[PDB]
């Protein structure tokens, strides 16, 4: 695959009509180190007319007024269209993102079959009705959009994240305001044009592109959008928190990353184990609100398990991303790179072996991390704590089942959770007791759309994806109606 | 002939199923007989450290989150039956501590019965979701799960209704709660904890705090242990909540809000039936409700008329001692909305609206009695027409089209109650669809048991509350993916 | 528009192989009179090939053990194929039934509706978890697809019928043995083609053409299929549940028709409701089971009210149905043209008053009936009990809701009924108090498959379209797991 | 504790007691001594209870009522069977042989499914389609179906009465029950509760006497909407027949089983074959439900075989007064000799008896004792045919998908166990199985919470949860359309 020659220049997307933009941001492949795209730095006059727009395409009933018949239409011309482009959205995702093109690609799979779940959970979408009230009384809950959605995506996931909120936002008749990552807006803009193409009205979906502190903090604050979709850090989720309560009490559909367990119980399926955790940790490069990065392993198999591990991660083939035969890409940012570094320095001092890894990968061009496993952890250590979002795994020991999901337990989080084991007891047990919204018994990182996805904890609020994704961004009326004559209250 | 207590009733809290005496006490008079009543515990933070700490071991220790529905269905059931035996007591407290009619004290108590039932059978079907749909290979699973310690803050004006309304749905999932009702009406609540450990609630699963939102309501907001809280009150007060969860552990909240309820009556409705409704809707518990019908929407040929019909049904309201089973409102429960509502009606005058009726206190020489109240003339930017008020002041607005009559429901913050009064199929289900709110009557008022959920849209908060929908906000949805047979390695 | 020079001659379907003829149903336009097609009848040995076929289908995990995302891939592609060669289904639905080819094109439409809506369920088919039955104890309910399934549809909607239910069934992982009504066969075997194009697995769709007495009983009695769709006549539903009885005890999805009233209230758009109540009666000529054949007009009103609908009737264009203008076309067969004017006979003899109509319409080619209403009908009438099935509206008034009611409910059926009133008491009163299945409030066959449909009382048993009619061909499985040890009985 | 005289009943319509003008005298199946007097009621009677339900329904004296009066009626009821425990376990064992601490185990039970269905009658809702456009508005009622008939069988009286009449009842239904001849007592206290708990006149009518008679009236009754039967596939089928030729009502069949349990050497086998006993003896394997089909693995085969013979060979028998006896009498003459006739044809085809094969000459009455045959054909009559006795018939298996096709070689699909740790084979079993009600290492637990039910020919539709409240309940569309309609015709 060629790199460009020139660097893309891209618009931003307003009440149907792409803009040219007046400052402008060069993003670089993180991979390669060669100008890719032109994103425009978008300012607050431009988000408030991007949140009239959307506001008006609600209200005139050009989307949320049409049969969900015709919203199913557009999502199921989109999910059409996202197959005939995948290679294109790949393409772009790897230069802005560094994910490997395999991986990309298994991405945009999801992202059909996302919309094509909010095609059909747009018809779908029901309330209740009542007639057990009595002779007198009619009762009956009706769904119906919320209106005007903000939509802000991190850059580990842009498109795949992107598309695991903004269909099923549109399903119930919602309209968009996104603001993608300025390090990873162009996919985004893509499924801009995607969604154009499929027949989406105007004003209904809007990117405005930029930093989070112009655009998403004037969204956070917005005094007319009715409800965030933020996926992202705990802090910037806080930030988004305290701004909601500030401006006009609009909803926040939370997801906010973690420091997710996966319990292994010596009865397990030891191989099939240590190649889930090795994936859990190393996929996206670790750069995973939902990646395994505590292991808690029964004593009896702790040593050979952790060891299984390591023999798994240095068997991970690192390099270009456009190689089909590379496993893990470039780390997005340099900031996220310092980040990651300096978490294992302070591990190796704070007291912790390294087992593996603790190393950049040195390519010459770009920026990459050794997979890292890291064994005699106090829960103290901030390694144990701290969300890394690097490909850097701790190792913690347990006897009994109830000491496995007490260190499991043991975080303000509670995003992702893995149980590994043949005993459907322990399987159940773990799976039931451990506070974690996304759970997978000897799998990782499975599950469609078909399923809610989301957090406990800190890890945020509300769900995505599913039938329950649709229904976030739906407001519930209750509606009873007298039949007949009413009692007088008055004399 | 009813008799106030010869001493206030001194109560004590209740941590860890262990009722507690008190060190500094609150001294409540009542509202409408200014006459020593109550004598309320001042709690502390520490008290509240110990309550959270009692319902994390209840919930941690499966004493109730292990049991079984049927068995939280049962303590559930028994406390409904233990209510219909109690429904007198329950009455005279909250009259004495909120300035309630006794015979609406008693109406209110029978839908804490229906709650209560509710909630017995909503135990037993909470429900997740199974995909047996997903491949040979995989099969998926939704649970669903107790959150764990609620706190719940209760306000002034339903003060055992709303907490029936919260409690036992909280209860239903596993949930352990930590409850604070108002300082002004916290006799009722301590009653309800008498009934639910005599019902057999396990220790530890239902502690009250009694004392002040400065002191334990802020201490709960930004408490570091509980999972999530459940208010009712003040957006102002929401807001404060939503800021403290943020600088606290992200708990999750519950908030019902205010509200500006609007009252669309249509030419072609019952104008005697919709005048009733409106008064009530209005006066009703003195206005002093959320889900009060605050913004009268009449279509023009019949908006004078219908206007002064109101006010006709509003002077007739017999105003007196709560006691009187024939008293139908009752006494403003505190000396701030009192005032607050003397102000609202003093700008009222001052920013051009006209008063039809009302405007004043009614003098019983003792008590704070305010009299209904209704403004014409009422544009929307006016203070009367945008802010809530809880009070018994009503603004009528007119309108000619249905197009209007939506706009107007709707221009507002809030998206609490609505009402809509019509006999055209087509009117009745144009208002429902298009007016923003989250509790809607056709031809009825504050009419729906708690088969339904309620909440609000835009600033009269978050979440729902009864129904089935209200046992689950409370719970936790948890995704399972299992994978059968052996996995196709990533790493040859 | 051509009609064809030779009858077009078709082969069965079976195990993914087109399979030729050894004997053939000629079958002519009911409207031109002209040879049209050559269908295959079958055997009871071609029937249990089907089942064998079906049967080899399911237990093979070719679809049902596919994930949902692949059934969905399927129905969805049919759907797209189905909108492309729209116009070549309604030649042939048109050739052999006799509908307005306009009409025809809008079925069509609602076709594509149903496939969408069924892709859509086939990921959102859901059971239960109960989490809440304490902490010894886990509960869970689970649907899978019943197995092999039976579908006989009638001739009156050929396609329709069949998009109604064919996909809903295909969409749990069941798999299908057609038999279609043999002067309309030719629509089914094109969706046969279709579904193969769309890369529906061999075995999963048969159709076995023939007649009821060979191949439909065949069905009703076959001790491997597991539930069985019959729509038609409730004599004939009967005939299948004795079937079943005598068989294997397979799960019954009756649609067996009714004689639907229509109440016309004085407060109602009388306009608006006279259209409808000629729409009702004059759609698809009468023959559909949906049909208002009893109009309960309001005594105020009822002889202005009946000049309208005789107004209405007579504006109504009949004529060939490939003409776009034409808004009703030929009765099916020469059987049911007979029971029509027969039963107008009977009607005249018995004292019932005709308004217009009342006679066939002479094009000497085809067989054409006008759309007939009959005044001063009472209720022993046998116009007023029997189902006709053809274009025959006989008019009842009522003085109070109590009457219209009392009426509406008159009789052994219950499939559909219509209520037409500006007064939301009384749309509600009769609404909730009329024993139909399918209501319409001012309003007349609206309605997408998002919803359910059946009949209560001899209409009918089960449901058919939205999620509930996916779920209908399910079996409904609980798994209760214990975990720990058990409390034994025996010491 | 001993009857001094038989107890004579009436029969309930429209509220009131009617006198019985010919009998059924019952003797205890354990004690061989008159203890009951059970009117045999007329196909007038019949006609006359159906008009009462129908009149009950139809003035909308219950179904018009809020949910809430049905669920304080249904839960007032759970308490006063909580108050009566003692005296409906009393009757229930003199009517039906089976242990006094079994039966009162039924009515904790009963008691369950009473509250569940007063939270249902509640909760008992269909949807809204606010989706479908600015002038096209849907919405699906559920609504109850109108007057029910209830067959009851002799196994379980006043258990599957009670797992049928409340849910039937919280909808809005009215009913028409026919217990069995020889267990009606139960049934017509559960009467005498619901009318002092405040249950109108006519909405639980219990019409006595003979399947032949009364039953066949009901099957065939022109005016009833609907027939829950519970009981055999042949009278199941008669009731289908019936259904046809008359009016076409509903049919909510719960019919019998040859119900597999899978043992796994992965298991507990020592908690397995405490449950496989269980299993088999559980109402002296007079269950629809019963575990009569053992399926375990060949490398741990004979040794569970041995295992289970222990537990079977400790049961104790005897006096269902005795609160120690855990396993009773057989309810019919008619019952016993078909099991002892099976147990028979069983030693003549070739099958091993390991224990058990006889009767229990306990002094009087009727009691079997624990049965298990090994090295049985799948041809074989005990193989094959519901006994509904304790007789236990053994297969050995090599894989999981042997096991699974065994356990699937019946015309059946009522009931299933699996014993093992491994959630792979758990779940197989349990997905691959056809079988409607599943215990994954547990057996016959569940609670009224979950629906419960047939593949096959075990029946037609659920009973029992929210879906099984629903079942009783007609789903009708509704679609409105809102301001001027485009007209078809200018
Ligand atoms: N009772 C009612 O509801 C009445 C119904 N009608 C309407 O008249 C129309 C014509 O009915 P009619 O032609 O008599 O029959 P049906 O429409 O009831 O028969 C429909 C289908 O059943 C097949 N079939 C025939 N015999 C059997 C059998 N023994 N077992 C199973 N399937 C069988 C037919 O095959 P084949 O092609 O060989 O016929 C056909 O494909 C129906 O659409 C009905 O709605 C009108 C009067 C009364």
Same mark, same amino acid.
């Given at each position: 695959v060629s790199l460009p020659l020139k660097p893309r220049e891209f618009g931003f997307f307003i009440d149907g009509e792409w803009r040219a933009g007046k400052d402008f941001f060069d993003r670089s492949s993180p991979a390669h180190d060669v100008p890719v795209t032109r994103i425009p730095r978008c300012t607050r006059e431009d988000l408030d007319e991007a949140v009239a727009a959307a506001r008006r395409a609600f209200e005139n009933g050009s989307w949320a007024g049409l049969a969900a018949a015709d919203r199913a239409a557009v999502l199921l011309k989109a999910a059409g269209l996202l197959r005939e482009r995948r290679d294109d959205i790949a393409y772009w995702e790897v230069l802005e993102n560094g994910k490997p093109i395999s991986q990309a690609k298994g991405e945009i799979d999801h992202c059909i079959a996302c919309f094509e779940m909010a095609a059909g959970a747009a018809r779908m979408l029901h309330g209740d009705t009542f007639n057990?009230?009595? @002779?007198g009384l009619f009762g009956m809950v009706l769904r119906e959009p919320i209106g005007v959605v903000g939509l802000i995506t991190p850059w580990n996931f842009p498109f795949m994240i992107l598309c695991e909120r903004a269909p099923f936002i549109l399903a119930s008749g919602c309209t968009l305001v996104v603001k993608p990552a300025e390090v990873t807006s162009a996919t985004t803009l893509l499924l801009a044009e995607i969604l154009a193409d499929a027949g989406l009205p105007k004003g209904v979906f809007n990117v405005v592109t930029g930093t989070g502190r112009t655009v998403g903090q004037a969204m956070t604050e917005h005094?007319?959008?009715?409800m965030l979709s933020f996926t992202g850090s705990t802090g910037v989720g806080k930030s988004c928190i305290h701004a909601a309560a500030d401006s006009n009490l609009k909803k926040l559909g939370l997801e906010l990353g973690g420091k997710n367990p996966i319990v292994v119980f010596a009865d397990s399926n030891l191989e099939d184990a240590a190649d889930a955790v090795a994936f859990g940790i190393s996929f996206n490069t670790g750069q995973?609100?939902?990646?395994?990065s505590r292991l808690i392993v029964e004593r009896s198999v702790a040593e050979k398990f952790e060891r299984l591990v390591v023999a798994k991660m240095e068997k991970i083939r690192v390099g270009? !991303? #456009?190689? !089909? @035969?590379?496993?893990i890409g470039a780390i997005t940012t340099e900031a996220q790179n310092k980040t990651i570094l300096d978490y294992i320095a302070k591990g190796k001092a704070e007291?912790?072996?390294?087992?593996c890894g603790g190393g950049i990968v040195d390519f010459g061009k770009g920026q990459y991390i050794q997979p890292t496993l890291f064994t005699?952890?106090? !829960?103290?250590?901030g390694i144990a704590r701290?969300?890394? #979002?690097?490909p850097v795994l701790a190792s913690f020991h347990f006897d009994t089942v109830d000491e496995a999901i007490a260190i499991a337990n043991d975080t303000v989080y509670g995003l992702a959770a893995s149980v590994w084991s043949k005993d459907i007891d322990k399987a159940l047990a773990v799976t039931r007791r451990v506070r974690a919204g996304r759970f997978w018994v000897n799998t990782i990182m499975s599950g469609g759309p078909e399923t809610p996805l989301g957090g406990f904890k800190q890890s945020g609020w509300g769900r995505e994806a599913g039938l329950y994704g649709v229904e976030e961004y739906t407001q519930i009326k209750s509606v009873h109606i007298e039949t007949g004559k009413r009692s007088h209250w008055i004399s």
């Open positions: 057990n009230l009595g @002779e005094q007319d959008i009715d995973c609100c939902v990646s395994s270009d !991303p #456009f190689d !089909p @035969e590379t496993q007291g912790a072996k390294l087992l005699d952890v106090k !829960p103290s250590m701290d969300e890394i #979002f690097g």
